[PDB]
Design a protein around this ligand. Structure first.
Ligand SMILES: *[C@H]1O[C@H](CO)[C@@H](O[C@@H]2O[C@@H](C)[C@H](O)[C@@H](O)[C@H]2O)[C@H](O)[C@@H]1O[C@H]1O[C@H](C(=O)O)[C@@H](O[C@H]2O[C@H](CO)[C@@H](O[C@@H]3O[C@@H](C)[C@@H](O)[C@@H](O)[C@@H]3O)[C@H](O)[C@H]2O)[C@H](O)[C@H]1O
Ligand SMILES: *[C@H]1O[C@H](CO)[C@@H](O[C@@H]2O[C@@H](C)[C@H](O)[C@@H](O)[C@H]2O)[C@H](O)[C@@H]1O[C@H]1O[C@H](C(=O)O)[C@@H](O[C@H]2O[C@H](CO)[C@@H](O[C@@H]3O[C@@H](C)[C@@H](O)[C@@H](O)[C@@H]3O)[C@H](O)[C@H]2O)[C@H](O)[C@H]1O
Ligand SMILES: OC[C@H]1O[C@H](O)[C@@H](O)[C@@H](O)[C@@H]1O
Ligand SMILES: *[C@H]1O[C@H](CO)[C@@H](O)[C@H](O)[C@@H]1O
Ligand SMILES: [Ca+2]
Lengths: 253, 445, 19
């Protein structure tokens, strides 16, 4: 389908972090109920050929065109042992489905009202900040994303269940073609989900960081205010690394 | 032997191009750090560094492009004169030297073309073969379908890629990895030719990498300006006068050329490089760089005078001088193009230049760059000499053939004449508000 | 060849219409 020129260009447009002298993995929670974050949310339910990010993910999974992996509590394993079986996901999260009319591009039959495109209201983003050795610049590479269904908790209270991990390389080709609008004040669909992620237009709070104890911010920040404070502290650490890289604004000479 | 002296090379001579100013190496933060918040467009900024280069003082004018058009016309006429089909005069195509040794056939530009009044029937037919007369209006103009320019470009960067080494053993310096004998590298190139029927056949060839010819791209491009743009760009307007006179009136000679597509601009740059090389004497070993369209990073650096505090190609943050005179030719008022004195483009150098010495980097006509357009293109380019180069395949989707445009034009609002604003256009599309200027890498120490 | 001069056109005379 793709031409040779396009393949070469795409392989030239991939970020490489192989020999980076510095690295840092950060797990952020992106809330779709915020402006500049609802780009992944609109439309909550499909409008003709318009779907939000989770609708596209669910559609690709309905075919055999997307491999997603189970959300484990502590680590990410994108191996065949953890590959998600679609059949034992709808029953697990109670999504109504029927036998399909054709096994091609359709594993089952799911109505739009069944698909939690509007209930999925948050995402997990696994960023990797890296320092390029040849260029001496700091960049961010997205490793994986994970939708969070916000369905009500049984017996009361709200329960947020992460669904599964989507390796970003697996979904990148599909989300580079669907144009979206990046604002409510300008409805032109002049961008894509891939541009939204590559430009780091999402705003999330750091919920985890790759450390030597495998600790998550929740394990030592009881109150939400403390969690926000810790996220601010870690963001300050990253920005301070970037600032300390360079000395062109030091006037103590 | 002895001590370690140096094997100095032979001193070269650098010819400073005419009509060009020098832009020094430096750094700038491309983009703006604040957004409008009413355009709904997030602000993107990226610091980059560029090397020194020569940049055209003004945008290419109608006469400057007419020189290219006239060269193409004269070359085609000479090719037809020394042709049995039209004429047959061998004196217009040299095939042997003064000693009889076979050589590369080429045109004899010394002998003048026959004058129409003094030309014979065959010469007159050859001369008229490149013209076209309207049967209704009886107007004789150069045939756009005959004004085609042929040129080749060698892809030095692709040939230098490690994955494209002609020897398989040299494509991987990791000794742990053994070079597969079956491994094949697929390369794409462009070729074009004129068939016996006279139609131009252009194609993208994909084949295994085997030789240096895999890195040569050949183009035959119709280069006559698209004058109908004036009518097509503005429905329900009386703009056919410009479609008839803008490129053909002597009073518009110094106005920027419009209706030129990205491919035609590249062809003009190649012709300019060849023309410049033909008329200079270069010592053995001397190597020069060719004229080219600027990169969007280079253009933005030159427009803002290498200063990150400038939004426009002038120091002040306003759009008028202290006396109320506008600093460029754009659309300042609602339905009010003429507030600055000009409705359509104006004569180049009608306003004050840059600190670098460049005119009309804001307004007049927006200018082609060599960068392929991408929404996240600023993040995907390099830190040094940033460039996003794409040679689209012919059978590629149309969406992949967009190139970045910079500067703003006579029909743009003040937002789009800001040096950091990016527009785009398809590579085969010409507009009545897009021109271009050329750049040349300068070897300076 | 040489540098990029211009291929100028032949100047025209503009008549001023009567009345
Ligand atoms: C003039 O240009 C038009 C294109 O606009 C050509 O017309 C095309 O081709 C004709 C046959 C068809 O009607 C259409 O396809 C049409 O689009 C037309 O043929 C002319 O260009 C051609 O002839 C030129 C010429 O005879 O001067 C060529 O000039 C250049 O190429 C020479 C190739 O050897 C080159 O010589 C070489 O380099 C020099 C520096 C020296 O080392 C010498 O020994 C080498 O052989 C000339 O210097 C160039 O000027 C032109 O390439 C060619 O397309
Ligand atoms: C682009 O490609 C077409 C062919 O697809 C070229 O040929 C034209 O197309 C045909 C259909 C028409 O009859 C004519 O118009 C004809 O001229 C066209 O000119 C363009 O050619 C360019 O690309 C070629 C390519 O990529 O194949 C270049 O390489 C070819 O020419 C070389 C000339 O030396 C040739 O090398 C010679 O032959 C080989 C077998 C070997 O003996 C070697 O030592 C010889 O020098 C290459 O193998 C060819 O591939 C071509 O030069 C270039 O203009
Ligand atoms: O004196 C100049 C002054 O500029 C500012 C800061 O960078 C200070 O640290 C410095 O002392
Ligand atoms: C809130 O306070 C607790 C206790 O000091 C911290 O662990 C947490 O990081 C946040 O600052
Ligand atoms: Ca301009």
């Amino acid at each position: 389908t793709l031409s040779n020129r396009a393949q070469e260009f795409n392989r030239r447009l991939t970020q490489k972090t192989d020999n980076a002298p510095w690295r840092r993995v950060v797990y952020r929670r992106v809330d779709l109920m915020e402006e500049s974050n609802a780009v992944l949310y609109y439309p909550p339910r499909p409008i003709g050929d318009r779907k939000n990010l989770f609708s596209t993910i669910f559609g690709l999974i309905n075919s055999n065109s997307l491999d997603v992996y189970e959300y484990l509590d502590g680590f990410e394993a994108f191996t065949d042992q953890y590959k998600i079986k679609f059949q034992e996901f709808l029953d697990r999260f109670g999504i109504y489905y029927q036998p399909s009319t054709n096994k091609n591009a359709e594993l089952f039959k799911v109505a739009d009202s069944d698909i939690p495109s509007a209930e999925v209201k948050a995402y997990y983003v696994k960023e990797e900040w890296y320092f390029t050795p040849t260029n001496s610049d700091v960049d961010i590479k997205i490793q994986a994303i994970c939708p969070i269904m916000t369905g009500q908790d049984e017996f009361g209270e709200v329960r947020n269940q992460p669904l599964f991990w989507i390796p970003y390389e697996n979904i990148r080709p599909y989300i580079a073609r669907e144009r979206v609008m990046l604002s409510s004040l300008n409805n032109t669909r002049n961008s894509t989900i891939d541009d939204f992620f590559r430009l780091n237009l999402y705003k999330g709070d750091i919920v985890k960081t790759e450390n030597l104890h495998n600790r998550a911010l929740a394990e030592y920040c009881p109150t939400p205010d403390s969690m926000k404070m810790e996220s601010k502290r870690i963001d300050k650490e990253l920005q301070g690394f970037r600032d300390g890289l360079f000395v062109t604004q030091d006037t103590t000479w | 032997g002895g001590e370690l002296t140096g094997a100095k090379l032979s001193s070269w001579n650098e010819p400073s191009p005419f009509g060009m100013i020098q832009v020094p190496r430096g750094s700038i933060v491309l983009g703006n750090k604040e957004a409008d918040s009413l355009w709904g467009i997030p602000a993107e900024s990226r610091p980059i560094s560029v090397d020194a280069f020569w940049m055209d003082r003004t945008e290419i004018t109608n006469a400057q492009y007419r020189q290219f058009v006239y060269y193409v016309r004269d070359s085609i006429i000479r090719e037809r004169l020394a042709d049995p089909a039209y004429g047959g005069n061998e004196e217009y195509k040299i095939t042997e030297n003064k000693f009889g040794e076979p050589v590369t056939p080429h045109l004899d530009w010394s002998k003048p073309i026959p004058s129409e009044k003094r030309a014979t029937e065959e010469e007159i037919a050859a001369i008229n073969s490149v013209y076209y007369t309207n049967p209704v209006t009886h107007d004789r103009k150069l045939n756009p379908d005959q004004m085609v320019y042929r040129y080749e470009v060698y892809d030095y960067r692709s040939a230098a890629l490690r994955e494209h080494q002609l020897k398989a053993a040299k494509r991987n310096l990791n000794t742990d990895i053994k070079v597969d004998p079956n491994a094949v590298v697929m390369i794409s190139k462009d070729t074009a030719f004129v068939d016996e029927s006279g139609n131009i056949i252009s194609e993208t060839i994909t084949r295994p990498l085997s030789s240096e010819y895999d890195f040569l791209n050949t183009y035959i491009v119709p280069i006559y300006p698209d004058e109908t743009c004036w009518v097509n760009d503005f429905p329900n307007a009386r703009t056919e006068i410009y479609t008839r006179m803008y490129f053909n009136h002597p009073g518009y000679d110094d106005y920027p050329v419009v209706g030129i597509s990205w491919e035609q601009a590249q062809a003009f740059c190649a012709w300019r490089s060849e023309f410049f090389r033909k008329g200079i004497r270069l010592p053995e070993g001397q190597i020069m760089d060719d004229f080219r369209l600027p990169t969007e990073a280079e253009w933005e650096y030159a427009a803002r005078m290498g200063d990150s505090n400038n939004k426009y190609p002038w120091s002040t943050e306003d759009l008028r001088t202290g006396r109320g005179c506008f600093l460029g030719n754009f659309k300042p008022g609602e339905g009010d193009y003429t507030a600055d004195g000009h409705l359509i483009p104006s004569r180049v150098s009608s306003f004050s230049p840059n600190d670098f010495g460049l005119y009309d980097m804001a307004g007049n006509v927006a200018e082609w760059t060599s960068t392929a357009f991408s929404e996240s293109g600023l993040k995907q380019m390099s830190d040094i000499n940033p460039e996003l180069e794409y040679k689209a395949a012919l059978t590629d989707p149309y969406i992949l053939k967009q190139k970045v445009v910079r500067g703003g034009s006579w029909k743009d609002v003040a937002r789009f004449i800001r040096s950091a604003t990016r527009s785009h256009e398809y590579q085969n599309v010409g507009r009545s508000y897009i021109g271009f200027r050329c750049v040349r890498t300068s070897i300076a120490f």
